[PDB]
Amino acid sequence: VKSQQQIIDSFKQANQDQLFQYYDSLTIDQQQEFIDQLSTIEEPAKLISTVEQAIRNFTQLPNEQTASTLDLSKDILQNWTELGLKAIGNGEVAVLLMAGGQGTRLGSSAPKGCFNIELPSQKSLFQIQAEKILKIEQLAQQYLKSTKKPIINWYIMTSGPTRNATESFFIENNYFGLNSHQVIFFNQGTLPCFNLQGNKILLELKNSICQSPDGNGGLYKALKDNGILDDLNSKGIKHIHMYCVDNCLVKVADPIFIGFAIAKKFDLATKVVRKRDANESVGLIVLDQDNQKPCVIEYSEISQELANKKDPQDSSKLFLRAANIVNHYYSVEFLNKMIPKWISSQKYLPFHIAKKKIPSLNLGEFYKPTEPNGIKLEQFIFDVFPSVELNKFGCLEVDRLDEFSPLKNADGAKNDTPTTCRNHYLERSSKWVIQNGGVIDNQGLVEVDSKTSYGGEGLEFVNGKHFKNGDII
Numbered sequence: 001v002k003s004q005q006q007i008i009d010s011f012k013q014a015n016q017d018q019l020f021q022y023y024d025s026l027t028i029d030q031q032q033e034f035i036d037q038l039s040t041i042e043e044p045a046k047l048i049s050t051v052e053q054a055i056r057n058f059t060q061l062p063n064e065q066t067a068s069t070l071d072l073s074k075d076i077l078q079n080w081t082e083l084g085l086k087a088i089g090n091g092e093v094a095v096l097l098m099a100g101g102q103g104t105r106l107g108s109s110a111p112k113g114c115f116n117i118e119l120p121s122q123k124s125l126f127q128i129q130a131e132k133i134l135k136i137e138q139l140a141q142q143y144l145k146s147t148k149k150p151i152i153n154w155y156i157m158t159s160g161p162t163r164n165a166t167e168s169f170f171i172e173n174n175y176f177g178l179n180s181h182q183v184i185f186f187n188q189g190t191l192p193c194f195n196l197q198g199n200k201i202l203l204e205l206k207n208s209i210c211q212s213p214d215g216n217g218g219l220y221k222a223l224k225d226n227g228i229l230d231d232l233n234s235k236g237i238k239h240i241h242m243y244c245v246d247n248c249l250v251k252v253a254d255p256i257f258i259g260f261a262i263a264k265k266f267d268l269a270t271k272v273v274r275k276r277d278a279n280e281s282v283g284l285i286v287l288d289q290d291n292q293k294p295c296v297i298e299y300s301e302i303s304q305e306l307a308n309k310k311d312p313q314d315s316s317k318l319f320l321r322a323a324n325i326v327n328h329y330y331s332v333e334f335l336n337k338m339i340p341k342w343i344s345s346q347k348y349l350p351f352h353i354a355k356k357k358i359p360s361l362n363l364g365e366f367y368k369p370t371e372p373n374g375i376k377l378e379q380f381i382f383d384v385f386p387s388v389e390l391n392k393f394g395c396l397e398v399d400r401l402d403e404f405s406p407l408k409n410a411d412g413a414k415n416d417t418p419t420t421c422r423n424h425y426l427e428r429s430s431k432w433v434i435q436n437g438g439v440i441d442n443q444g445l446v447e448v449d450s451k452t453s454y455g456g457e458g459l460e461f462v463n464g465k466h467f468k469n470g471d472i473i
């Protein structure tokens, strides 16, 4: 621990004198708290240098590293399903939920997982995913003929701001049927916010700097610091499924995805769907021709010309169309070996710059700006992809209508709203029912309860039966 004076000196030597503009006029407790806040920032001069640093030839992945659920035979998919249900039934599968984002585009005070897309069940994203988990645990247990149901640890990464309401939500709901010990919360770190030029850290208040979650890429360090990686080893976990909280269709702990990784012996794998259109705000999974490594090019950093390139083999398609749906597979053995490397260098987790309108101290009191006035920093979870060996990387293309419908925007937008989430969810439910001989009245849509079906299976009993709009099956 450094003394109050030492923390101050270090920030001054890093040229952050603006941070102490009003220091002397603060009470002693405000000064002590400010210093406490400042001391969590490891090596400021470096960080400010690293931020300075922050301020192309791609092609499609080789066929050898790709596979698609829309092409594989029922037997292969069934075999992967079994490989995954076995891993699950043996207590080898854990799930990592990234829920540290603020979801600004959604305009809501509560954490996004608490969001209710108004399905007939009124169930939140969090509840939907928890029943998804209970369900696959049962499917795994049936498959293995176990007496006891396997447990799938659900590690939920929250941010300082989303933590209390998230944990409280789960407690208030008795964990949605899950064992209280299998839902494990841990906070990711933050990074200071900077001025538009990126050389000065912004003051939120006379005695506090503006800070924000360090991006989903800050998960690796949170994993190590919060003893999560330690827990994986102690519980004998071998497989990890990491996903985004906003996907209302997400197949949590999808046995097919896990079987796919097991079958091929992949250290790392990821899911993609066909890009909606040139402008869809999705990263794209490609092969960097320069180093012959898999990687993702984010939607906010790809050139307009490249996002619109037509495919040389087919004019009607976009050349780069493997949209990233934030569904990753990691082997625990790969994480044990790589996490130490990934968090001790900007090489695999470079900062990403995002201009923002940041409510903060005016250069002299608070104020809500109406044009960008600073930058937030973010590390991206996929920046470690090129560190994997190509033949150890897998890319599974899946069906969007069954696996990806994100909640990104408040109602009113054309895409990725509570309304599109709801419709996609009900359409998938209705299709499963109908696909099983069920009959839904015209203009009717039903909801399938995960307790009844994880993803379409076990719906045979629905044959010949009729349904009305809004029924829950």
Ligand SMILES: CC(=O)N[C@H]1[C@@H](OP(=O)(O)OP(=O)(O)OC[C@H]2O[C@@H](n3ccc(=O)[nH]c3=O)[C@H](O)[C@@H]2O)O[C@H](CO)[C@@H](O)[C@@H]1O
Residues within 6 Å of the ligand: 098, 099, 100, 101, 102, 157, 159, 188, 213, 214, 215, 216, 217, 243, 244, 245, 246, 281, 282, 283, 284, 296, 298, 299, 323, 324, 325, 326, 379, 380, 381, 382, 406, 408
């Ligand atoms: C960096 C990244 O993943 N980009 C992906 C993200 O875009 P996008 O920019 O929309 O990312 P989001 O901001 O919604 O974050 C993705 C996920 O990471 C979480 N999160 C984010 C920031 C943070 O500090 N902590 C944290 O836990 C969010 O809670 C969410 O579960 O989803 C798109 C699919 O919809 C993909 O095509 C993009 O490639």
Ligand SMILES: [Mg+2]
Residues within 6 Å of the ligand: 062, 063, 064, 065, 066, 067
């Ligand atoms: Mg292939």
